[PDB]
Symmetry: D2
Subunit: 397 residues, 4 copies
C-alpha cells in the first residue's frame, strides 16, 4: 500500500518498517501532482542493492564535487557527505565553523546537489566519447549528514525533502540537541525519524534513513519525560543550571536507544570515539537479539590514532571484520578534509622552498597514477571541454 505511493521501491524495501502515519496521510500531504526525483530514486535503490549484495560498503567524506568524482573513478561504490566538513569548508554562510550546526540548514543538500552535478558531467563526458563508462555508474549513492534536523520534526521533514531534491540516497539523524553532548528523549528522536519517513513518503522516494545515537558519550539529557530514558538518569545529581538531567553514558543506553529506533530507520549507528571490534560486536549482538539481521552503520574515526592504538594486522582487517558483524555501511567522516588540507600544506611548503620543482613532483606523481586510472592530468577533458566541443559541433550547421 506504501509500495503504491513509492513506485520505485523494490519488493520488501519496507520489511519491518513501522510508520506513525497512514497511506491516506501521505496522499493528503503530497500535493495533487506527481513530481519525479530521479537521482534520489536511483541512488536510494542503488544503495539498497549495494548494502544487501556487498560484503560491506565503505565510503569517504567528500568536500567537493571533484573529490566525490575521484572517489567514484577510483572504484568506491558510495559517497559520504559530512556535516563537520560542511561546517569546515563547504558552507552556505561561506564561513569556517566548528561542528555545532552553526551553518544555515540548506548547506548539506546544496553540497549533495553539487556532487551530483559533477557526477552528471563525468557521466556526460564519457557518454559523449562513446567508448562506454569507465566505472559501474557515475551516480554512486550519497549518504548525508542531517545533524539533529536543525530544530523539531518539521525542520527534519524539510531537511529530508531538500536532500531528496538534491538527489541523496540516504540521510542520517542524531539524538543530540546539537548544542559536552546533550541527548533528547528517545520519543523525541523517534518523532524526527518519523518526519523523515513522512517526507520520503511524500516525495515518493524510498530514501534510506540512518538513525544515530550519541549515547556512548553524552552525560546530559534535556528531559526525563520518557520512561525508556529514566533508568539512566542520576536523579540524585540532579539537574544542571540549564535544567538538563545528568545521565549515565556508555553502551547500555546506546543499545536501548538503538532497539527503540530500529523500526523507524533503515540503518542504526552508534557514534563511537574509540574504534573497538569487541565493543562493535557487543553492540551488534545486542541489537540483533531484538532485531535480527538489522542493517548497521559505522563511523571509522579520523582522530583516533590508528597505528598507535592497534597493530597493523588489526587495522588491515578492521572493515572486513566490521562487515561480517553486520556493519554494512562504513565511512570515514573527515577523509576529504584531512586529504585536502595535508596535500596543499605539503604542496605549498615545497613551493616556498623550491618553487617550480615542488609542482614538478606533483605532476610526475599524477603521470605515474595514469596506469592506475587517473585522468585529471588531462585537465580540460576532466572538466568537460571535449563535451562542450561536441555540443558546439552539434549546434553548427
Amino acid at each position: 500500500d506504501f509500495y503504491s505511493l513509492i513506485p520505485s521501491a523494490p519488493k520488501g524495501r519496507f520489511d519491518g518498517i513501522e510508520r506513525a502515519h497512514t497511506a491516506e496521510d501521505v496522499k493528503r500531504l503530497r500535493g495533487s501532482v506527481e513530481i519525479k526525483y530521479s537521482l534520489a530514486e536511483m541512488g536510494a535503490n542503488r544503495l539498497w542493492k549495494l548494502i544487501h549484495e556487498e560484503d560491506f560498503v565503505n565510503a569517504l567524506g567528500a568536500l567537493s564535487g571533484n573529490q566525490a568524482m575521484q572517489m567514484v573513478r577510483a572504484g568506491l561504490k558510495a559517497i559520504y557527505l559530512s556535516g563537520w566538513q560542511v561546517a569546515a569548508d563547504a558552507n552556505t554562510a561561506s564561513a569556517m565553523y566548528p561542528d555545532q550546526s552553526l551553518y544555515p540548514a540548506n548547506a548539506g543538500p546544496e553540497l549533495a546537489k553539487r556532487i551530483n552535478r559533477t557526477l552528471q558531467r563525468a557521466d556526460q563526458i564519457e557518454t559523449a566519447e562513446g567508448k562506454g563508462l569507465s566505472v559501474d555508474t557515475w551516480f554512486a549513492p550519497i549518504v548525508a549528514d542531517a545533524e539533529a534536523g536543525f530544530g523539531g520534526p518539521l525542520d527534519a521533514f524539510e531537511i529530508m525533502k531538500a536532500y531528496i531534491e538534491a538527489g541523496a540516497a540516504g540521510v542520517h539523524f542524531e539524538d543530540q540537541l546539537a548544542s559536552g553532548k546533550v541527548l533528547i528523549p528517545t520519543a523525541a528522536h523517534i518523532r524526527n525519524l518519523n518526519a523523515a519517513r513522512l517526507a520520503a513518503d511524500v516525495m515518493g522516494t524510498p530514501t534510506l534513513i540512518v538513525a544515530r545515537t550519541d549515547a556512548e558519550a553524552a552525560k546530559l539529557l534535556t528531559s526525563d519525560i520518557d520512561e525508556r530514558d529514566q533508568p539512566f538518569v542520576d536523579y540524585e545529581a540532579g539537574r544542571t543550571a540549564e535544567g538538563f538531567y545528568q545521565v549515565k553514558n556508555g553502551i547500555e543506553p546506546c543499545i536501548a536507544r538503538a532497539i527503540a529506533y530500529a523500526p523507524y530507520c533503515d540503518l542504526i549507528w552508534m557514534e563511537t570515539s574509540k574504534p573497538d571490534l569487541a565493543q562493535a560486536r557487543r553492540f551488534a549482538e545486542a541489537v540483533h537479539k531484538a532485531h535480527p539481521g538489522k542493517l548497521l552503520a559505522y563511523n571509522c574515526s579520523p582522530s583516533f590514532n590508528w597505528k598507535k592504538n592497534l597493530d597493523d594486522a588489526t587495522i588491515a582487517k578492521f572493515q572486513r571484520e566490521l562487515g561480517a558483524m553486520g556493519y554494512k555501511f562504513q565511512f570515514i567522516t573527515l577523509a576529504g578534509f584531512h586529504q585536502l588540507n595535508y596535500g596543499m600544506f605539503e604542496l605549498a611548503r615545497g613551493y616556498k622552498d623550491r618553487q617550480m620543482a615542488a609542482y614538478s613532483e606533483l605532476q610526475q606523481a599524477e603521470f605515474a597514477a595514469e596506469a592506475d586510472g587517473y585522468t585529471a592530468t588531462k585537465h580540460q577533458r576532466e572538466v568537460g571541454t571535449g563535451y562542450f566541443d561536441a555540443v558546439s559541433l552539434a549546434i553548427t550547421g
Copy 2:
C-alpha cells in the same frame, strides 16, 4: 594628488605612470554621498603593492577553497591566486562542473574571494584568542583574482571589479579575449575594460591592483579591425570567417604591441603563455621595458606544460627566481589547487578501496610527520574554530 585625495589609503607613488580616462570630479559624481569602508580590500592592496616592490618576486598558487588558501598562508606563501578555470571546475554559483570559458555566473569569483577571506579571518581569530601571537606574517595574504573578460562590456567589468573589492580582493586581472581558438577584442575595447575597473576602484576608494592580460600569443582571431593598432596583424587576404571575425597573426609581436598599449592603464602586465621559455619571457620583458621602464610584470606557470620532459631539473629549479630578476614580480600556478585536490583524493580513494583503514592510517601518519614542518590540521577541532567558539561561550556566561 586629487586621486590620492579620493583614495586615502594609497601609498606614495601608487599611481605613478598611471593614466585615467575619467576625472576626480567624475568619481565624486559617481561615488554616492556616503563613505563606505572596505578594510580587507585596502589592506590586501597596500600589502600587495609593498610586497611586489620588495621581494625578488611574489609566488602564488591557485586556491580552490578557503581551507586550501589557509594552508597556503600557514606554509609561508605571501599571496593567494584565485583561478577562473578552477571556479568553473569545482567552485561556482551554478554548482556545476564547467570548462574554462565564462559559463558560470559572474558572481562566482567574488564569492570565492569572500570565502577565502572568511577562512583566513577565522584562522586569525583562533590564534588571537590563544593570545601567543600569529604563526604567520599575516593571515590576510593579498588575493589576486581572475575576472575573465569582465563578463560582457565595460559596465560588466565595472561591476565585477566592485564585487571583488567588497569581497576584499587585492588585485583583479582582465583579458583581451571575447571568451567565445581564442578571439581577441580590439585594443581599444580592452583599454575601455581596464578603465572601467579603475573607475570602479576609484569609486570604492581603494588602491586595488589591476592586471592586464593579453591572449595574443595564441589567438588567431579578432572580432573587429576598427583599431589601427591591430590592423598591422590582420591577414586581410583570408579575409573574414563565417562569424565575421578577422584572421590575425599571433605570437610575441602582438603581445608586445598590446602590452605597451595597455601599460598606462594597469598596474601589472601579463602575457598568457602555454610554453614557458625564459628567453621568450626575457624578450617580452625587455621590449615592454623600453616603452615602460620598470613596469611590473606577472607570469603564469603553465600547469599542463610537462616540465620534466621539456626542461632540466636545474632550469626548473631556477625558473621562478630567473623571472623575478627580469621583473616578473607576480608569478602563479593557476591550476595547482585543482591538481592537488584531485590527485590526493584519487590516491587515497584507490588505496582505501584496496586496503580500507590501512590507507587512511598512512595519510594520518604522514600528517603526524608533517607537524614538525608546521602542519596543525591534525588537531582538526582547533583548525576549524571550536577552541575559539569555546572561548566565545565562556565569555557569554561570565
Copy 3:
C-alpha cells in the same frame, strides 16, 4: 524519432520545426541516465495546449512567488518572468540594475524556481484541505526571459537547461548584443535558437522557444557578414567608432528576421516600445505569408502612455484584436514592478501622514476583495500554517 527522445511531447508538437542536430547528436550529449523534469514537462504541455485553445493567453511579469500566486488565484493562465524585473529587484547579485544583463546568468532560473515552489505550496495547502482546488491548476506555465543568452551559443544552452530544471515552460531569446541597441547577425541568433533547442532535446522536455527580434528600433549591427542583413546596412555611413555597422531599422528587417528565425522557434516576437494594431497586423500578415499559422507573441509596453496615445475603445479591445491576428501569447513585462512600487509608495505615504488609519484602509480593501477570491487576509493559511499543522499531526 525526436518524440522518442522527448516522451511527454504531444503529437505534432514539432510540426514545421527544423533542427541543426540529429536525434543521434542528442543521444550522445544527454548522458547515460534518464533524469525527469516534471514541472517543465507539465508547464510546456499546458502552455502548448493553452496557446492553441484560448483566444489569446495573457500574462503579467512576476517579481516574486507571492505575486505569481495571486496571478494564478485571480484566474490568469500563465506567468511571465521578466529580465528587467530580475535586474530591478530579484537577482543573485542582490543589487538594483538597469536592463543590460548586468546580473549573474543564474538569476532568472532562480526566480522561476521560487515561483514554482510557491505554487507547489499553494497546491499542497488546498490538497490537504481536501475540498478540491480553487483554480484550474496552480502550475500555470512560466514564460521566462533568457535575455541574449548571456554570451554565445553555449551560454544559451546553459540557461535553457537551468530554466528547464527550474520548471519553466517557455524561454525567450533576443538577437541583440546587450553586452542604443546593437543587433547580432541573423545567423548568430539562429545559432542561439538552435542551442536552446538542443538543450531542450538533451533534457528530454518539449520546452517552448520564443525568438525575439529587436530590429524595430536598433540602428546598429555587429557585423554585416550575413547576406540576409546586408540589404539593411547603410554602407555610406559607414561604421561607428567601436566598429559597428549602421542599419535601417523598422518593420522591414523585423519581418525578414522573423521569417528566417521561424523554423527554429515555436513563437516569434517583434519587440516594440510603441503599441500599434496596424504595425502588429503588417508584421503578422507578412510572417504568415511565409509561415501560415505561425504562433506569435506581443509585449504590451509598460512605459508607453496608454491613455494619452490611444483612445479608450482601442485600449479596451487591444489584446482581443491582437489575439485575432494570431498573437497567442501576450504579456506586460514590468507589471509587477509597477504594482509593487506604486502600492508601497502609497501605503508608506498615508502611514507617514495618518499612521494606523492608512493600514486600516489597506486592511478593509482586502476584506472587500474576499468576495472576488482574495484569501491572503487569512495570512497564516495562505503561507501554509494549516498545511504544516496537518504534517505535524501526521508525524504524531
Copy 4:
C-alpha cells in the same frame, strides 16, 4: 574601555547596560585586524538619534529592496524587516513557509543586504544628478528579526554578526523556542541569547541596537522551570506535557516580569501582543518604567487584528501617537509589505483577466497622479539606475 572598542558609539550609548563579558574578552575574541562596517555604524547611530529625538519612529515590514526604497522615498525614517515575511516570500531556501524558524539562518541578513544595496543605488542615482537628495538620507536604519536566534547563544552570536555585515541598525531576539501554542525558554536562557548578541556587536566593534522580545502574553508552555523567576507562573497542577514541557499562565504579569529581567541586557523592550490595547500598553509601559525609568520600548501593530471592527476611527487615528507618549519609540507593522504586495497583485490580475489593457492603464494613470506627491517610479528606467550607468559609461568612453 568599551567605548574604545566601539569607536563610533556616541557618548552615553551604553548607560544602564550590563554585560557578562569584559573588554578584555572582546579584545581576545575579535582577531588582530580592524575591519570596519560603515552601514552598520551609520544605521545604528542614526537609529539611536531618531528614537531619542522623534516623538516616535514608525516603520513597515519590507519584503524587498524596492519596497524599502519606496518607504524611504515616501518619507519614512526607518525600515522593519519581518521574519514572517522572509518565511513567506523572501528566504534562502526559495520556498514559502509559515514562521516557525524553518528557513535557513542565512535569510534575514541576506534581505538586509538586498535592501541596503537598493538604497545605495537610490543614493548613487541622486548624487550623480547633482541636485541634492530628495530625502534626509537614503540609508534609513534597518531593524531586523533574528527570531529565537536559530539555536543557542552561538547561533545568536552568529546571526548578530551576519546582520552587522549586512548593515542592519538593530536586531530583535525572542524568548520562545520557535522550534499548545508558543513555547518559552527560561528567563536565564534568553538573557544568555541577548548577551551573545551584545558580545557579537562588541567583537564587530559597532553600536548595533539590541531589541528584546517577550512572547509570554500568549505563550502557555515552557521548556523548563529551572529559573526561579519563571516558577511563579507555572501551573504545577497541570503538570507536564508529552514533550516534557511545563504548562504556564500567560499574560501581562509574566511579560512584565520578563521585560524587567531583560532590561539591563538590551536597548529596547518589546512585549509581543496580538490584541492592540492602549491601556495594556500603558500598563506594561508603567510597570517597566517603575524598575527602569525612561527605558526605550517598541511596539508591534498586529496586521491580523481587525482594526476597524475593534476600534473607532479616532482611536485608530491616534493609536501610534498615544503609544509614543508612553515611551514606545520604535513602532512597526510586521507584515505591511506582504499584505500590500498580495492585495495589489490580486486586484491588478483580477482587472487584467476581466478587461486586459484597461486594468493596466488604470494603474498607470494612478502612478501619473502620484507623481505630484514625490513618486518617481513612472520614470521607470531612471528608478533602476539607467541614467546612473549611462554616466558611468560616459566617464569610461567619451
